């Protein structure tokens, strides 16, 4: 059911917002981290 | 169904691992960030 996927996406939407705050806080060695950090969450959202 | 919750937890388990890597990377102004970062993911896992 799409509700399950929506719930999953909703959870990740929340993770993305908090993760974004962390990413907006770290400004040094997070260029590589940002790629994996955003890529992974994006991959999870994209995959599901 | 518990499968939905398990899927949700599984997604957060994945977020926690990646988030942990970010937290293990940032070492400066993330004491406050860590509290919210871990507290939020923990809150989501705890709540669901």
UniProtKB/Swiss-Prot annotation, chains A, B:
Which ranges carry the Orange domain? 8-41
The compartments listed are: Nucleus
What top-level branch of life does the organism fall under? Answer: Eukaryota
What does the entry report about post-translational modification of this chain? (Microbial infection) Ubiquitinated via human cytomegalovirus/HCMV protein IE1 that assembles a HES1 ubiquitination complex; leading to HES1 proteasomal degradation.
Subunit notes for this chain?
Transcription repression requires formation of a complex with a corepressor protein of the Groucho/TLE family. Interacts (via WPRW motif) with TLE1, and more weakly with TLE2. Interacts with HES6. Interacts with SIRT1. Interacts with an FA complex, composed of FANCA, FANCF, FANCG and FANCL, but not of FANCC, nor FANCE.
The UniProt comment on domains reads: Has a particular type of basic domain (presence of a helix-interrupting proline) that binds to the N-box (CACNAG), rather than the canonical E-box (CANNTG). The C-terminal WRPW motif is a transcriptional repression domain necessary for the interaction with Groucho/TLE family members, transcriptional corepressors recruited to specific target DNA by Hairy-related proteins.
User: Which purpose does this protein serve, as stated in its record?
Assistant: Transcriptional repressor of genes that require a bHLH protein for their transcription. May act as a negative regulator of myogenesis by inhibiting the functions of MYOD1 and ASH1. Binds DNA on N-box motifs: 5'-CACNAG-3' with high affinity and on E-box motifs: 5'-CANNTG-3' with low affinity. May play a role in a functional FA core complex response to DNA cross-link damage, being required for the stability and nuclear localization of FA core complex proteins, as well as for FANCD2 monoubiquitination in response to DNA damage.
Q: From the Swiss-Prot or TrEMBL record, give the protein name.
A: Transcription factor HES-1
Tell me which species this is from.
Answer: Homo sapiens (Human)
**Portion held of the full protein:** 103 to 150 of 280
């Amino acid at each position: 059911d799409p509700s399950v996927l929506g719930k999953y996406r909703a959870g990740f939407s929340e993770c993305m917002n908090e993760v974004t705050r962390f990413l907006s806080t770290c400004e040094g060695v997070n260029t590589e981290v940002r790629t994996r950090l955003l890529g992974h969450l994006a991959n999870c959202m994209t995959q599901i």
